Symmetry: D2
Subunit: 26 residues, 4 copies
């Protein structure tokens, strides 16, 4: 648990959500 | 209770996470 | 931006997701 | 591409957030 882990997880989750939103509409 | 509602929900959650990242930095 | 805000947001989002999962199945 | 898949996805995202909170504390 550190700033780099928090940042990486937050950015991975945001990208996972962009992909999920994209496929949901398609 | 449709795809549009889930889509808006997902965008809202994504932007709440971006706001945490921006505040953290 | 601080530890209390991060904690509160993470806990609010988890609870919002418990409610969304609950209503999705129902 | 059904409700079961979205349900598992949502549980996965929720548990990933609990893991960040636990690591933070
Ligand atoms: Na970046
Ligand atoms: Na608590």
């Amino acid at each position: 648990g550190n700033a780099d882990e928090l940042y990486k997880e937050x950015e991975d989750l945001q990208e996972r959500x962009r992909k999920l939103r994209k496929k949901x509409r398609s």
